[PDB]
Symmetry: C5
Subunit: 270 residues, 5 copies
């Protein structure tokens, strides 16, 4: 679609806000361990790697419906909502500042417990359509739960780049992060931003503020354009691993807030 | 409230300073371990987790009364104090540079003792009303002391985002950091800045200088506006954990200094 | 070659995109451990050090053929000039995995240690092969003969031997522990590398589609593609995987490139 | 004083330079362990904590007498204004030493553990003594009477007691664990500090002669030297050296200052 | 000498390149462990600390002879070469990415070996005369090899700043880093840049690129001026410690490349 100028005048700007709850494996709000995975079940061998669905963190996604812009669809030009900037925040960070939760002792049984630590993964995206994904796994011989969306008919090539392994992030809590990542060869109409630090016991590091805005405009001054007046918000915020007294382990996630400013953009009627 | 222009002229600027003492759990200045929590008392299980009030760090808050500005409340326009910038500093940082305090030896009994280390959490906020808070916990089955302000009738939803778990930071030493964090969906009239590094034994890192100012104006050039001529200052500065000889542990906190510059802002009378 | 002005007008600009699969040692897509090295075989001594080819990560290289620009007698020619690149290490979140068969973090009730330790990231974009300098940990290492390594090593190759030079002209052949970008050459290539060592170091990576690197030099000139060929080179070693028996495999990830090129006028030589 | 404009013309600018040696506890240059604290002596309990004077790092301070500027009648006077400073921790590379007596890294065939753990770096440049705020880890600690510490301590002193104030007016007398710069004062000093804690943390330091710190405030005014005196203050604890017996000493390094000053006109008070 | 303006015109700019090989202790290219120190030999006691020359890393220095500028030395003004900017690079960084070198196992005898790690020291300097040095040691009772250049007649004062402990970096592989550092009270005619990270097992961190230039001009816009048409390049690049199977240890250094751009500067004839 040919993109023209920004539409000026009163009522040309709008703003939405939303939060996405984490989807660490216990994904129902009545689950005792909502916001965590179940105890990790580890592969027995290369050939026998059957991770339980509840142990696998997935991506969060929400579709926000925006006000309808075009009365009749037959004028030479149309309007689309253009995402211009976002304020985003990982919520409840200070919940990890807690040394009394049941778990593994830091020293002996007189000490506090080890807080959430280890691998972290933070991703947010804002687009005018679903986030486009690339499949890649640690091991093609893992058998994934069938009620999740994973790579069909995996082979060892899927341990690196197979250009046939593509998907859309179109379902909340279904696409495992260990299988899918943002596809940089597409996503022309989405801006995504991601951060990873690995390790078993790494100290998690996070900032929180209401003073920072990310501008979503591309090199040409154009932000994501919302097809069918729909805005797509995606996230994952794995903040580390909680270790229990018995040494079993649960992934821990946190929710993410989005505040997106949008404006009206003229496009040519296709 | 329709915000208008900055009032210029002599005496249009004022400046306040304040310090907030840490509320680590021992919050009475006659407490032997004032500036620390009591020995952390750890849950025996998921179901049984009763942290003592003295073991839970809370937010500091102070209200600064500013000179009154409006004689007539008849006038078509009124003046409010607008917070423009802040210098803020964590005080007594070098008190941590101490290897003789009674505790746990670094190596054997000929060595110095382990200094304060582990999880850190730093936050300051400057606003024209109480900081708005969102509740989220590590465990919804925790029983919090009834004399603290925490989430009423928790369910497992409270381990992630429950949109009903909201509060105002309107009491000093009452809101546990492990339960509450700044709400990014509100706080239009407060600037907050936060930094977290987790981990069991992580070395703390801190800077101190009198050369750095934070500017508090939003993207329209408007800082926090002080309702009823009150300026709200909030903080928490957990600098880590002290470990005792028996391996019991206390949170350690430090005081925070604020120097705030304010100016007169014209607003439309409501 | 004398470099003249940029050629303006419609069709003055083109873009390409490619990805390079990692070459960690298992370099065939049907290899069970594709994207990993084989179990590291360690030297029993300084004198006795014969690493298997499957255990030695090598540089990835791709040559992209660009639209033919030039008749070859005009007094000025056109060359494709690489102006900027968006590049991305793909599959980063694949490391966010605690269930893979391996070594337990704590006892046997816990998750397994994820990929961690030494990392090496390099990308380059050039108008000819990346020029290489040879330097090794040990000059007494015997390398696999079917790889390209330093000929007739002496202890001088543990430091700078001005004679140990090569071109990155084959994919999966030049070991990273032998070869590195030659800063005394490479006038026509831009390279960018970072290294963090250690055995257990947590890996750190970012991913976004918002970042572009400008390739122009201090005279405003990017790499100029000789014979309309664009050279893309990479290595992305994201750490070490540890197996249950404590054997270890290097782990690598693929890299994406999106390069923008413009027509540059040059004086005919 | 009412501060007026900068005085221009020939000879309006000056430079001084100085070094301050560290005061870690062994503060006499003939001390066998000069530049180190004596072996750390640890408290037996909350009630009993009697650190020896020689175990407690203190701030360094020097007063530089500047050229006499003024007669005192004139409606306006000149003061030296500290404009900028180049400052350097000297002898950083002295830490790059694994043969020194100490605790083995692995077994007795290995090198010894180098200086590591808690570090504290501070420098200040002002026109009067640095103003200090008292705060300690323990109010029941008994400090050496020959040092300057907080009078009549109570548990409030484990946090902010607004009465606990002092001036850094003596070299090697004010313990860093008792005093820090007071941000509620120090209008006429600029101070800069960084702290990293932990018991075994690797120290990190840079050294260059290319970096200057500008000392002007948001009104373009630097510290003004009362009575033509310039105050330089510092502490540079670079970590802890551990002996074979596992007893431990703080290690400090000297700091160099090069300050540029100019003449500032002020109203006679 | 009085420094005047930059000389303009054709042929006013020259460019040199050079490499400096590391001087870790095994400093002869035929040495089996060239580019490493010999096994560290640890002090028996404070009184008995005799490090072997081969165990002590020294600075690298090279003198580059530049084209002769002044035809008649009686003219009232003269030209000097002025170092304007440098591109510099540590070479062979990726040689460290090697887990099969003989050494100490990361885990048991089935694993890779521990790569080079621990204390790093990086310095480069570009000057128009020898880099000026200040003496400072960890221990004044250390007995250094007489074949090296160290502090004469050490006393305890040399554990801190002795103003009489000065030297010039005027010989390659002779001035140990543990005794000498750049003197900030001098070096008006040299620019030096240094970086240190200690510890015994710290991961080394290095970058490499050909896209970065350091500008050498001072605040008056004057770079180092090459006395007698000599350009002084100095370096040390200790990238860590290699541990052998028997647990003995060797410093590891890497060579450094320089590409310095120079221009002609007018000076008044003294
Ligand atoms: C992430 C998180 O919140 N982890 C909890 C865990 C988990 O709920 C559990 O591991 C499932 O993943 O529970 C922790 O406490 C449990 C632990 O102390 C075990 C003993 O190791 O006992 C459990 O209670 C038992 C009780 O002991 C028995 O008398 C009874 O038969 O059953 C109870 C419930 O099964 C504790 O809940 C843990 O450390 O694993 C606390 C963590 O914070
Ligand atoms: C990078 C990676 O994927 N590593 C795998 C490894 C490698 O595939 C393997 O080390 C070759 O380099 O395999 C891991 O699982 C193996 C391990 O559990 C060993 C026990 O030490 O047994 C292997 O299965 C055997 C099995 O024991 C026999 O019954 C069978 O007949 O032969 C099988 C094949 O050898 C496991 O596959 C590993 O931890 O080493 C899992 C890693 O994820
Ligand atoms: C933050 C802080 O200052 N921690 C102290 C602690 C705390 O005061 C205490 O743990 C309460 O939270 O005390 C430390 O010293 C005590 C320790 O040596 C214990 C031995 O386990 O003894 C205590 O003194 C006892 C004494 O031993 C008895 O004879 C007497 O009957 O009672 C005394 C007081 O209970 C020490 O105070 C500690 O290591 O726990 C020192 C820390 O710095
Ligand atoms: C920096 C470096 O490359 N270190 C080497 C070292 C050094 O060359 C050496 O330690 C002197 O600094 O050698 C390493 O391999 C040796 C090691 O396995 C030892 C056993 O601890 O044996 C040496 O070979 C011996 C062999 O074992 C004997 O049977 C024979 O009689 O003598 C041989 C030579 O002494 C190995 O060379 C090491 O681990 O120390 C490998 C390091 O990479
Ligand atoms: Ca594409
Ligand atoms: Ca809102
Ligand atoms: Ca060259
Ligand atoms: Ca004040
Ligand atoms: Ca001097």
């Amino acid at each position: 679609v040919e993109v023209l100028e920004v539409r000026t005048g009163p009522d040309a700007i709008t703003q939405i806000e939303a939060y996405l709850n984490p989807r660490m494996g216990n994904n129902n709000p009545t689950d005792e361990l909502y916001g965590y995975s179940a105890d990790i079940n580890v592969a027995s061998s290369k050939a026998s790697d059957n991770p339980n669905a509840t142990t696998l963190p997935t991506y969060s996604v929400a579709v926000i419906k925006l006000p309808m812009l075009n009365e009749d669809m037959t004028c030479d030009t149309l309007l689309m909502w253009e995402a211009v900037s976002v304020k985003t925040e990982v919520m409840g960070i200070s919940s990890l500042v807690n040394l009394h939760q049941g778990g593994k002792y830091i020293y002996g049984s007189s000490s506090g417990t080890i807080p959430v630590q280890g691998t972290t993964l933070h991703m947010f995206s804002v687009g005018g359509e679903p986030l486009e994904l690339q499949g890649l796994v640690a091991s093609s011989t893992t058998t994934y739960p069938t009620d999740m969306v994973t790579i069909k008919n995996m082979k060892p090539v899927n341990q690196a780049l197979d250009p046939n392994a593509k998907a859309l992030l179109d379902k909340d809590g279904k696409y495992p992060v260990e299988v899918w990542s943002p596809d940089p060869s597409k996503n022309e109409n989405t801006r995504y931003y991601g951060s990873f630090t690995g390790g078993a016991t790494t100290p998690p590091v996070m900032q929180f503020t209401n003073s920072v805005t990310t501008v979503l405009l591309d090199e040409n001054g154009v932000g994501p354009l919302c097809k069918g007046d729909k805005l797509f918000l995606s996230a994952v915020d794995i903040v580390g691993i909680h270790t229990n007294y018995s040494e079993s382990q649960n992934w821990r996630g946190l929710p993410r807030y989005f505040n997106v400013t949008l404006r009206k953009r003229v496009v040519k009627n296709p």
